Short mmCIF file of C-alpha atoms and ligand atoms in Angstrom, two decimals:
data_model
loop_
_atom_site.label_atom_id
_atom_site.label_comp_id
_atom_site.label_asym_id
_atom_site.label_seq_id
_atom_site.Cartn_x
_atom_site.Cartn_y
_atom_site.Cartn_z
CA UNK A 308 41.73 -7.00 1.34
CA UNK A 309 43.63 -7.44 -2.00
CA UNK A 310 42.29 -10.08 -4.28
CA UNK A 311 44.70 -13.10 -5.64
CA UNK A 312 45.83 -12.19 -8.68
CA UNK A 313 47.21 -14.56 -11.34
CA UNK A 314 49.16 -13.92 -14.65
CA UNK A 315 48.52 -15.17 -18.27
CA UNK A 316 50.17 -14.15 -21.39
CA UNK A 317 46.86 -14.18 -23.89
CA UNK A 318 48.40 -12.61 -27.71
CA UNK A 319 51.36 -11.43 -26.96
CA UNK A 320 49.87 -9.54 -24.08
CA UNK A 321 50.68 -10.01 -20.02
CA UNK A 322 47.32 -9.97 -18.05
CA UNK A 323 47.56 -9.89 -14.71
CA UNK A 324 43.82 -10.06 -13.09
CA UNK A 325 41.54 -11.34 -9.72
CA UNK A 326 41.10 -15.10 -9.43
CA UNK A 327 37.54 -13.95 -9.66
CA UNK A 328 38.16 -13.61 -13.44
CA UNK A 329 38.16 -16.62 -14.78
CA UNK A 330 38.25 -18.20 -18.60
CA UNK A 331 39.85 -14.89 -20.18
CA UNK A 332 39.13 -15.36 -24.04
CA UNK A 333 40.19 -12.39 -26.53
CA UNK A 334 37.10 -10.51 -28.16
CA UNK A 335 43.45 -1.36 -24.79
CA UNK A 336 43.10 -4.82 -25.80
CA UNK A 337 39.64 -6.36 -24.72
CA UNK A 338 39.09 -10.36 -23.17
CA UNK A 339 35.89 -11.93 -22.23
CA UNK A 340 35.66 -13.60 -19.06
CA UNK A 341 33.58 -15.51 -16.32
CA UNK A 342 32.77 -13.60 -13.27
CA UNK A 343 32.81 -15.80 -10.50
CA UNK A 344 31.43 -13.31 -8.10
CA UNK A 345 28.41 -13.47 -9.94
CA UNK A 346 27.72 -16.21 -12.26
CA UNK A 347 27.80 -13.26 -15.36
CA UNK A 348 30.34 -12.73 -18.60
CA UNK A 349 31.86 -9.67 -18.51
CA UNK A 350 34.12 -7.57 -20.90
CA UNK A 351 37.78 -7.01 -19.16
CA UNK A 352 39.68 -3.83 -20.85
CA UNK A 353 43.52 -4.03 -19.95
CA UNK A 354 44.45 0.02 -21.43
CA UNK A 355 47.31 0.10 -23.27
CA UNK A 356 50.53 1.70 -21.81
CA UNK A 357 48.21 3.85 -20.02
CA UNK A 358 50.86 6.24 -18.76
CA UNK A 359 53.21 5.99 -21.28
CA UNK A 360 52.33 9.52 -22.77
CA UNK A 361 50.50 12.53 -22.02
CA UNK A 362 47.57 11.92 -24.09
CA UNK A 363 47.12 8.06 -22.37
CA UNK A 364 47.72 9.33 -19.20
CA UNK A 365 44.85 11.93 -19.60
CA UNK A 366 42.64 9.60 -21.32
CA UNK A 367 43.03 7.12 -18.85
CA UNK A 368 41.92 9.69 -16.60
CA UNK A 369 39.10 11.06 -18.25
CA UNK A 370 37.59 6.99 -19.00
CA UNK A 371 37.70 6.81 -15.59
CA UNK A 372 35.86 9.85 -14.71
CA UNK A 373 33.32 9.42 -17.49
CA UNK A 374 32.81 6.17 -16.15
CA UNK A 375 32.12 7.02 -12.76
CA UNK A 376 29.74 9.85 -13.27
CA UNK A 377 27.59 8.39 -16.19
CA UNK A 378 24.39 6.10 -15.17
CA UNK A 379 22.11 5.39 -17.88
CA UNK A 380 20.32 2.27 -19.26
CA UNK A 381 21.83 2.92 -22.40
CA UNK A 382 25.03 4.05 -21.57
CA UNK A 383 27.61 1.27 -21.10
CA UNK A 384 28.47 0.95 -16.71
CA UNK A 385 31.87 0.50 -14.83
CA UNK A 386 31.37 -2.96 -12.84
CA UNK A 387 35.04 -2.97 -12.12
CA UNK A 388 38.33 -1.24 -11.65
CA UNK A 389 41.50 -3.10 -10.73
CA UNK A 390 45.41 -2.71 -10.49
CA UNK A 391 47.96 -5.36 -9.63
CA UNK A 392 50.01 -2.79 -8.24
CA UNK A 393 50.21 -2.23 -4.07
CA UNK A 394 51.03 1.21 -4.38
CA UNK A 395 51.16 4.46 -6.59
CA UNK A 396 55.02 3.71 -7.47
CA UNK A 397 54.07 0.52 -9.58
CA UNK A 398 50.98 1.68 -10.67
CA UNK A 399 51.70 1.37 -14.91
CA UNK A 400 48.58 -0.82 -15.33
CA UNK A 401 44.90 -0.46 -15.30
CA UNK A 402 41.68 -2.84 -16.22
CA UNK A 403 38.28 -1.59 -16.71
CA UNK A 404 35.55 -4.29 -16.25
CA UNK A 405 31.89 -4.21 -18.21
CA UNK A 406 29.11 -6.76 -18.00
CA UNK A 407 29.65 -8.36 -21.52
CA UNK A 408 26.76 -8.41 -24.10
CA UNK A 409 25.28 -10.43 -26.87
CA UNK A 410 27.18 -8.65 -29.72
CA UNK A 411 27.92 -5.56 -31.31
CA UNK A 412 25.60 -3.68 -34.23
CA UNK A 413 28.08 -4.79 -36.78
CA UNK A 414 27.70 -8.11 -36.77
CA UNK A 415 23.80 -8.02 -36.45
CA UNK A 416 23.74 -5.57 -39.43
CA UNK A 417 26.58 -7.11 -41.75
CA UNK A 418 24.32 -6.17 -45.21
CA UNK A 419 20.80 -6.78 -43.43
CA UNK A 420 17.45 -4.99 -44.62
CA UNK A 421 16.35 -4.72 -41.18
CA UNK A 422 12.40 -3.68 -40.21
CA UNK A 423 10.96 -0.91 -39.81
CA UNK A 424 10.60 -1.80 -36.12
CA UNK A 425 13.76 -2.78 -35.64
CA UNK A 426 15.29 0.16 -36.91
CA UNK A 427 12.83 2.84 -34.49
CA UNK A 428 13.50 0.31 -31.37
CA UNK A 429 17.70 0.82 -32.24
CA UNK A 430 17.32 3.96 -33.41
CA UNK A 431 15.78 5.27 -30.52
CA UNK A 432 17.61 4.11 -27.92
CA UNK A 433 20.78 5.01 -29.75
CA UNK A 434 19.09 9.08 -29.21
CA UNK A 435 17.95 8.22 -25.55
CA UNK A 436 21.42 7.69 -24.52
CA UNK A 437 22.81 10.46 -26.73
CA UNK A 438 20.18 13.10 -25.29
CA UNK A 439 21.65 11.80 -21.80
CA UNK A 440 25.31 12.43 -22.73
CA UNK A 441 24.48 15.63 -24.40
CA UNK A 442 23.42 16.64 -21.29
CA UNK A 443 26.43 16.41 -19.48
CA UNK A 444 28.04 18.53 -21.72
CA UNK A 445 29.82 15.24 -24.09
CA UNK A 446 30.16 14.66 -27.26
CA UNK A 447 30.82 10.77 -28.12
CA UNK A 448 33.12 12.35 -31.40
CA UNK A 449 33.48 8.53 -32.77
CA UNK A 450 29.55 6.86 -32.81
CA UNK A 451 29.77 3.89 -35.66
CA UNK A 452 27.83 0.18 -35.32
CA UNK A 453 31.79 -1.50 -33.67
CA UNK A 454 30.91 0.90 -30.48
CA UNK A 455 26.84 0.22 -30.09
CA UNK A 456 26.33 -3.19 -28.09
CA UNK A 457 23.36 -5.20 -27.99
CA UNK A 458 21.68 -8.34 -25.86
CA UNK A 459 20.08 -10.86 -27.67
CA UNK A 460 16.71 -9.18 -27.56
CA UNK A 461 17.89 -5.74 -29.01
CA UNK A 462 18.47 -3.83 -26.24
CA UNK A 463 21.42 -1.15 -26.98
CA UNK A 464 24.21 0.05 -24.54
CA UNK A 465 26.90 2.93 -26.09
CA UNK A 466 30.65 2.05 -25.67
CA UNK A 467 33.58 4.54 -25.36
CA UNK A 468 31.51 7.96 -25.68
CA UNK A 469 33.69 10.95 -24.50
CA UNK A 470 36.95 9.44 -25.15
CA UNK A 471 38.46 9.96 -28.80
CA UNK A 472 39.25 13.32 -29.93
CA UNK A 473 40.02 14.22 -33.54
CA UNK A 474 43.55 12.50 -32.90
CA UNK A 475 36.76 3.94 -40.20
CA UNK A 476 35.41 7.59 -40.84
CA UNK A 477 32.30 6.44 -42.70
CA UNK A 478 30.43 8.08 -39.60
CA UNK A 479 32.44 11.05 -39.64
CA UNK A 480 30.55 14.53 -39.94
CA UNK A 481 31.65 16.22 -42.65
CA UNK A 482 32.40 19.53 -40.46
CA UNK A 483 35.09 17.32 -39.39
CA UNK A 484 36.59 16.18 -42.45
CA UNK A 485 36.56 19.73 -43.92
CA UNK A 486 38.56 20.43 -40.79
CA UNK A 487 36.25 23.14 -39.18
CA UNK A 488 37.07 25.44 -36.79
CA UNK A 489 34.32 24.62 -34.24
CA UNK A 490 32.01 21.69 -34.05
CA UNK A 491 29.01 21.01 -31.65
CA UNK A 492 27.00 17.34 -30.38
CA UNK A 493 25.25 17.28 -33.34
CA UNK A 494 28.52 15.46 -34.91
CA UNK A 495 26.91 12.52 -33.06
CA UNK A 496 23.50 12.94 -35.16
CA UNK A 497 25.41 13.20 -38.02
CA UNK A 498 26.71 9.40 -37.17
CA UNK A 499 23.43 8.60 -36.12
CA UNK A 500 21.94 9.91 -39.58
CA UNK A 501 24.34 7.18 -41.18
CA UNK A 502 24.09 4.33 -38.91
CA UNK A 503 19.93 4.86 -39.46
CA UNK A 504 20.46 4.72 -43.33
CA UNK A 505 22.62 1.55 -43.25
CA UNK A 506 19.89 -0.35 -40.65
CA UNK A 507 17.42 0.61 -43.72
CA UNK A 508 19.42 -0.32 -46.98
CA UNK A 509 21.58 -3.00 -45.50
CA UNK A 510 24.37 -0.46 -47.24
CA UNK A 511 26.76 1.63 -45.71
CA UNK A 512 25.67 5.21 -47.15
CA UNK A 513 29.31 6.79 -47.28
CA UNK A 514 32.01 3.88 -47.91
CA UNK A 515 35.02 5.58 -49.01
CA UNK A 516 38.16 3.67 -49.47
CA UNK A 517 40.66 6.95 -48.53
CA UNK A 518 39.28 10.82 -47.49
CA UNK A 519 39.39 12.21 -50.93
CA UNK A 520 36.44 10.07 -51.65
CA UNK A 521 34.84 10.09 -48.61
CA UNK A 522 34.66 13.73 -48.81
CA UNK A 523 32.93 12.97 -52.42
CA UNK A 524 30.62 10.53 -51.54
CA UNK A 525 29.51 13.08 -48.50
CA UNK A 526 28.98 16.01 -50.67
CA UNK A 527 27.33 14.10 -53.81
CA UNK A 528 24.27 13.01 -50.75
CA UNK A 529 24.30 16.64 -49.28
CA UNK A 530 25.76 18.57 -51.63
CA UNK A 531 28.44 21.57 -52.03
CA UNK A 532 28.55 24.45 -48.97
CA UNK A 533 25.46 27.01 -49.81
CA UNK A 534 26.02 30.80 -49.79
CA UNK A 535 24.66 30.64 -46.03
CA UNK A 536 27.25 28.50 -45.17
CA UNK A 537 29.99 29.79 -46.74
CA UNK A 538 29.24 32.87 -44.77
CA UNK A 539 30.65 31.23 -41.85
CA UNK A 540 34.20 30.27 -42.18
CA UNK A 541 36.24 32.83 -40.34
CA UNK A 542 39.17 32.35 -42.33
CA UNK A 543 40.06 33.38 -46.12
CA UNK A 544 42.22 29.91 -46.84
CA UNK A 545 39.32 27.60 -45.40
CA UNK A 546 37.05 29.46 -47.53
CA UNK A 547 38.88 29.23 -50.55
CA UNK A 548 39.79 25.60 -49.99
CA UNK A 549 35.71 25.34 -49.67
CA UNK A 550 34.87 26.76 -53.06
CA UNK A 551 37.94 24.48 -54.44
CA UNK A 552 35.35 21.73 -53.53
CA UNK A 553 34.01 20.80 -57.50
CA UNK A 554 30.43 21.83 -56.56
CA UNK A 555 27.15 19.17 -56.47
CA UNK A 556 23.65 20.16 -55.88
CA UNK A 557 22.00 18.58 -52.45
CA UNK A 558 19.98 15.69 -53.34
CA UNK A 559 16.39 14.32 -52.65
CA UNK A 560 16.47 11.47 -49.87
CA UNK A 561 12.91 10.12 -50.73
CA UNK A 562 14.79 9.03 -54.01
CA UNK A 563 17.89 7.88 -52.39
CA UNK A 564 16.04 5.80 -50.01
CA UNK A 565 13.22 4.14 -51.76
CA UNK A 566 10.88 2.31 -49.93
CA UNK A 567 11.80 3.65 -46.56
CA UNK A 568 8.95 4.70 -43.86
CA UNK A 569 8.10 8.43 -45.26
CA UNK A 570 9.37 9.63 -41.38
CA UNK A 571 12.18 8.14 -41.65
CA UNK A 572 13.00 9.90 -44.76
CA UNK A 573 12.12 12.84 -43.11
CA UNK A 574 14.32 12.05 -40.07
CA UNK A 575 17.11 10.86 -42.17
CA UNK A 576 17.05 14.55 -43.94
CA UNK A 577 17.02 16.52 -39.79
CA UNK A 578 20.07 14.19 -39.12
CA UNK A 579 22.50 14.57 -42.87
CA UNK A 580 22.04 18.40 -43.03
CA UNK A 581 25.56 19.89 -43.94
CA UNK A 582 24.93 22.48 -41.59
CA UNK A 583 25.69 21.62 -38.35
CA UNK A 584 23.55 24.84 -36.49
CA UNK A 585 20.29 23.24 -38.66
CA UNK A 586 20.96 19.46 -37.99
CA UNK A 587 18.11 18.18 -35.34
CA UNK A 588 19.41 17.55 -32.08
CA UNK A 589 19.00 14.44 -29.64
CA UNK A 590 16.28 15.43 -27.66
CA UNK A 591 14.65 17.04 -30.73
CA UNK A 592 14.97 13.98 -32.69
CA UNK A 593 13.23 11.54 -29.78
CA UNK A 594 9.89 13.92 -30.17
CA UNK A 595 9.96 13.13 -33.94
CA UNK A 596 6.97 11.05 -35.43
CA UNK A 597 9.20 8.32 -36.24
CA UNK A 598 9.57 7.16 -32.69
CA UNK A 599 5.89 8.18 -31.60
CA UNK A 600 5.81 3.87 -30.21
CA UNK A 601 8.43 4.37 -28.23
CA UNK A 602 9.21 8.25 -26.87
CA UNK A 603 7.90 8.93 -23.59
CA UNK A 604 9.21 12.59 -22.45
CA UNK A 605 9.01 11.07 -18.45
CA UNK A 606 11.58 8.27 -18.71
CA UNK A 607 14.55 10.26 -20.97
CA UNK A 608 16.68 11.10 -18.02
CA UNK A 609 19.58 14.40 -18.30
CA UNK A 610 22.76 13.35 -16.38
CA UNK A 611 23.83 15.28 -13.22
CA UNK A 612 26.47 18.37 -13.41
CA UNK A 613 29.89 16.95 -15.01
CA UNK A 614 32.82 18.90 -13.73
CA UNK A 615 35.56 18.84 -16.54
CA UNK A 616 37.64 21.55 -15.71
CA UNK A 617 40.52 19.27 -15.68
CA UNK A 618 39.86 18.77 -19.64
CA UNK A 619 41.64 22.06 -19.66
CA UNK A 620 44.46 21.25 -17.58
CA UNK A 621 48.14 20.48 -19.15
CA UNK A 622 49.52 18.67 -16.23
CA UNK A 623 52.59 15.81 -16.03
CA UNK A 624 52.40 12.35 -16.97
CA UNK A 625 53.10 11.40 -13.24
CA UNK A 626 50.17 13.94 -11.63
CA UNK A 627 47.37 12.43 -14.61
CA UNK A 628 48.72 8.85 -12.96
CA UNK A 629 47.94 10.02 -9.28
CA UNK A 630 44.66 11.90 -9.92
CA UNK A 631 43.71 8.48 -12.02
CA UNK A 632 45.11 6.19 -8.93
CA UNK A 633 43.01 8.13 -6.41
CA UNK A 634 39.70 7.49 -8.87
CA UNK A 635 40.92 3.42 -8.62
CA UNK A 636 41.33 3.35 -5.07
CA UNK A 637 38.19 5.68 -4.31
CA UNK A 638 35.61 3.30 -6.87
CA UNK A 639 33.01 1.66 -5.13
CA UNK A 640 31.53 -1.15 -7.19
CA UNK A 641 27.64 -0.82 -8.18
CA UNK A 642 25.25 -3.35 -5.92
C1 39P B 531 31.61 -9.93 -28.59
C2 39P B 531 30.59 -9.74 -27.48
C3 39P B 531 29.88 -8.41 -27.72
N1 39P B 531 30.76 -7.34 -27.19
C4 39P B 531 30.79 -6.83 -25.93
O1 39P B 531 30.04 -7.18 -24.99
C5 39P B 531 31.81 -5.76 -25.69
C6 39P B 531 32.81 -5.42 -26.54
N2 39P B 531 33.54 -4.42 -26.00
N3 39P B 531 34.70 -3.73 -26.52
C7 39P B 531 35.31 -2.74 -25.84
N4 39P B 531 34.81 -2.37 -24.58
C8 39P B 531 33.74 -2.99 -24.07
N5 39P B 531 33.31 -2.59 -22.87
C9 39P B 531 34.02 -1.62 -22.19
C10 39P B 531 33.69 -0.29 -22.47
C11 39P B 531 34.35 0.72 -21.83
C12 39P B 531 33.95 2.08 -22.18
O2 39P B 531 32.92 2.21 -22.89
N6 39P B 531 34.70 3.11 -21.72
C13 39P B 531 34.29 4.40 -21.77
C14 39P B 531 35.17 5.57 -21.75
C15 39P B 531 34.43 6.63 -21.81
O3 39P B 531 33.13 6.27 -21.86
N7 39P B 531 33.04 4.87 -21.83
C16 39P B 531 35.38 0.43 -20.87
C17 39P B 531 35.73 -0.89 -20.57
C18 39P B 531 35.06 -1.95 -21.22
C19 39P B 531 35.46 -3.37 -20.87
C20 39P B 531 33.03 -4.10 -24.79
C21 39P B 531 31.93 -4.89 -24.53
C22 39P B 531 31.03 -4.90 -23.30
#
């Protein structure tokens, strides 16, 4: 039986949710609220004209269908999915429901010289939930502290992993800035790499104010493309525009980060190799040292077979809204 829904206008913005939502305070746009259902806060996503293009219809889709098929303690889960429309002609809108948490790794971090502790315990979940998605054959593309949420006692739940394509970019991989033909999951330890050196300096390692610089700043850590790497580039303009590049030698990150836990120096130089086919991977990184107090090779589940064929698909704005309709109507909230 369809819920009662009621309207609000909250910034501009019509929501139109179940009475069971009560309390709706701004935080797709995103709103806090009380779930009466269950006593809990929860985050409420309303997308944003999710079907007014092909690229929002398609992502709409493919939150959905990451949401459904991803169960993981670290991995944010779907509580909720709701339309005010009765049928598939005025379906236009779509809300995603979360339980909501304590706060995000921002906030927490905003210039702090963390522990040592602290840093393994976030650290290592952050790689638990990456070795999971990995699995499934996902790359989150966009990891940076706005999209890591944590409860009160520090334990860490990913946001929006799977979604963003290469349409901040202090997390950025350089591979991707460079504007390289092919790219692989360890664009996600590459983020990690950074987020890890800003829990242990209280800095952020590469904050450039446009790409030019943030390109500099990258390369003046990691330095210039080697002769090994160079070898690489396919094409005779992208390897040009490489050697254009004013050339810096790599430096040494036992310098750069003084006072650190030797391990995670040695981490830290696994995760910001410029070359992504020698940067450690997820799983590889969990059996480092570093995390010996926490990594237990028993309880750091793979996901289950993730069909994606329709990632590949170029289909109409109208079919991406039924195949996504179909997903609504067939979810079956967790127990
Ligand atoms: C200020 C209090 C601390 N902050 C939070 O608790 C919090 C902030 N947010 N912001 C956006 N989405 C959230 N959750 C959320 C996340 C997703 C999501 O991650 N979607 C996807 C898409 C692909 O993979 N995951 C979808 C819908 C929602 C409400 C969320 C939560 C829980």
């Amino acid at each position: 039986e369809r819920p009662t829904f009621y309207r609000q206008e909250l910034n501009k913005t019509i929501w139109e949710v179940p009475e069971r939502y009560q309390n709706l305070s701004p935080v797709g746009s995103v709103c806090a609220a009380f779930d009466t259902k269950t006593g809990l806060r929860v985050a409420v996503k309303k997308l944003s004209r999710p079907f007014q293009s092909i690229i929002h219809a398609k992502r709409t889709y493919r939150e959905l269908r990451l949401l459904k098929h991803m169960k993981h303690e670290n991995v944010i889960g779907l509580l909720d999915v709701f339309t005010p429309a009765r049928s598939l002609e005025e379906f236009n809108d779509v809300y995603l429901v979360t339980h909501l948490m304590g706060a995000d790794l921002n906030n927490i971090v905003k210039c702090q010289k963390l522990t040592d502790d602290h840093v393994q315990f976030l650290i290592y979940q952050i790689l638990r939930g990456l070795k999971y998605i990995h699995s499934a054959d996902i790359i989150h593309r966009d990891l940076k502290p706005s999209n890591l949420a944590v409860n009160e006692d520090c334990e860490l739940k990913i946001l929006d992993f799977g979604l963003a394509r290469h349409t901040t970019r202090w997390y950025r991989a350089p591979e991707i800035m460079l504007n390289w033909m092919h790219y692989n999951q360890t664009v996600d330890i590459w983020s990690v790499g950074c987020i890890m050196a800003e829990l242990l300096t209280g800095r952020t390692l590469f904050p450039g104010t446009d790409h030019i610089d943030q390109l500099k700043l990258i390369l003046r850590l990691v330095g210039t493309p080697g002769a090994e790497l160079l070898k690489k580039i396919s094409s005779e303009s992208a390897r040009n525009y490489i050697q254009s590049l004013t050339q810096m030698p790599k430096m040494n990150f036992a310098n750069v980060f003084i006072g650190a836990n030797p391990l995670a120096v040695d981490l830290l130089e696994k995760m910001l190799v410029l070359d992504s086919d020698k940067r450690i991977t997820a799983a590889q990184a969990l059996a480092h040292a570093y995390f010996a107090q926490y990594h237990d090779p028993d309880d750091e589940p793979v996901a289950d077979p993730y069909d994606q064929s329709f990632e590949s698909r170029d289909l109409l704005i109208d079919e991406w809204k039924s195949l996504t309709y179909d997903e609504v109507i067939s979810f079956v909230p967790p127990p």
